[PDB]
C-alpha cells in the first residue's frame, strides 16, 4: 500500500543512514546514543530539512520494537496548553521504564507554535525528569521559544540540504521509480528546491505524471519547468536584457510576451531578476538601494493583489531608474 502514497510520505527515511545532508548532526547523535547518554536536543532550521525524519529514525534505532511505549510525540495538530503539558507530559515522563530499556524520549514537533506559559511550564518538567527522560524540540522559528528553554536544550541546526544530498536522494528516487532525469533538469530541481526535499519529491512526482510514458521517456528540463509553471533561465535573462537595454515599449512588449506565451507569473520573474542581479558589478551603492527597495515594494504590492500590467511597468521603470545611477 506504500505505492498509494505521495512521494513526500513514502520516501520518508526510516533509519539514520537515509537522512542525507545533516551529516554532522547524525554523527553527533550517533556518538551520543552509542555512549548511552543523550542530552536534551533541539532541532532548528528551515522546513523540509529532515528535523522529524531524523528524530523518528533516532527513536527507532534506540528503542527497537519499543518506539510506541517509549516515545511520546506531540505536535501543533494537537493541543499543547498548560493542562496538556502539566498532565500528559508529566505522567509520561514521571513513570518508570516499561522494560528498563533506557530513557523516555519526548518528541515535541513544531514547538515554536506554543504559548510562552506552556514553554515555561515545560522547563521544570525537562530539568526535574532528566534522569529517565530526554526532551527533543523541533522548531522552525527560534524567536518563538523562551531563552531559558533554549538554554536548557542542546541546539542542533538543520541547515538547508546541500546539492550533493539532494542529488543522492534524487538518484535513489529515480532508481526506485525507474525514471530518467537529465542533468540540466536535476540542476533545475536543485535550484527550485532551494534546500527542501519535499519540493523536489513533489516536482518529480508531477514530472512523472506529466510524461505520456513514465517508463521509456526521460524527464527533461522543459518538463520540470512546465509542470510547475516556473520561468526558464533564458526568458528571465531575455526580460532582464530588454529592461536594461531596450526602450520602454520593446521592454514592455518582451515582458508581455514572456508572461503570456508561457503563463509565467510576475512574482516569479521578479525573484529571478533579483537572483540574476545579485552577481552584478553595480559600482554605485545607490543602485543597489534603489533596486532592493523598489523591487521589495513591488513584491509587497503583488502579495496584496492588483493590476499585473501596472506592476510589470513598475518593475521595468524601477529597474531602469535604479540603473541610471550607474552612469
Amino acid at each position: 500500500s506504500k505505492e498509494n502514497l505521495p512521494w513526500v510520505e513514502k520516501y520518508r527515511p526510516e533509519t539514520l543512514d537515509e537522512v542525507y545532508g545533516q551529516n554532522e548532526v547524525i554523527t553527533t547523535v550517533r556518538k551520543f546514543v552509542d555512549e548511552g547518554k543523550l542530552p536534551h536536543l533541539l532541532f532548528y532550521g528551515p522546513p523540509g530539512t529532515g528535523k522529524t525524519s531524523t528524530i523518528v529514525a533516532l527513536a527507532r534505532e534506540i528503542y527497537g520494537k519499543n518506539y510506541s511505549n517509549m516515545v511520546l510525540e506531540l505536535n501543533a495538530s494537537d493541543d499543547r496548553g498548560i493542562d496538556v503539558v502539566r498532565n500528559q507530559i508529566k505522567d509520561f515522563a514521571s513513570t518508570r521504564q516499561i522494560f528498563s530499556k533506557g530513557f523516555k524520549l519526548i518528541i515535541l514537533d513544531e514547538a515554536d507554535a506554543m504559548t510562552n506559559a506552556a514553554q515555561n511550564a515545560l522547563r521544570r518538567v525537562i530539568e526535574r525528569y532528566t534522569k529517565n527522560t530526554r526532551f527533543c524540540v523541533l522548531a522552525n522559528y527560534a524567536h518563538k521559544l523562551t531563552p531559558a528553554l533554549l538554554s536548557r536544550c542542546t541546539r542542533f541546526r538543520f541547515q538547508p540540504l546541500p546539492q550533493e544530498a539532494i542529488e543522492r536522494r534524487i538518484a535513489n528516487v529515480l532508481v526506485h521509480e525507474k525514471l530518467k532525469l537529465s542533468p540540466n533538469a536535476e540542476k533545475a530541481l536543485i535550484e527550485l528546491s532551494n534546500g527542501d526535499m519535499r519540493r523536489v519529491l513533489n516536482v518529480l512526482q508531477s514530472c512523472k505524471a506529466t510524461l505520456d510514458n513514465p517508463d521509456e521517456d526521460e524527464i527533461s528540463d522543459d518538463v520540470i519547468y512546465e509542470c510547475c509553471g516556473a520561468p526558464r533561465p533564458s526568458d528571465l535573462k531575455a526580460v532582464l536584457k530588454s529592461i536594461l537595454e531596450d526602450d520602454w515599449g520593446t521592454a514592455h512588449y518582451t515582458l508581455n510576451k514572456v508572461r503570456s506565451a508561457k503563463g509565467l507569473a510576475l512574482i516569479d520573474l521578479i525573484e529571478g531578476i533579483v537572483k540574476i542581479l545579485e552577481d552584478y558589478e553595480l559600482q554605485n551603492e545607490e543602485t543597489r538601494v534603489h533596486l532592493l527597495t523598489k523591487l521589495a515594494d513591488i513584491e509587497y504590492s503583488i502579495s496584496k493583489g492588483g493590476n499585473d500590467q501596472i506592476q510589470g511597468s513598475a518593475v521595468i521603470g524601477a529597474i531602469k531608474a535604479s540603473f541610471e545611477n550607474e552612469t
Binding site: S94, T95, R96, I98, R128, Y129, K131, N132
Partner: protein, 33 residues
Amino acid sequence: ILSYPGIVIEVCMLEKESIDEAAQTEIELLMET
C-alpha cells in the same frame, strides 16, 4: 478483575519513578508501626 465464564478485566499500570529517596525510607519507617 473477574466477576459464559463471566467478564475478565485485565488492566496494567506503570509505576512512578519515585524521585525522592527518603520517600521510600519514610514509608518503610511508617509501616513499622
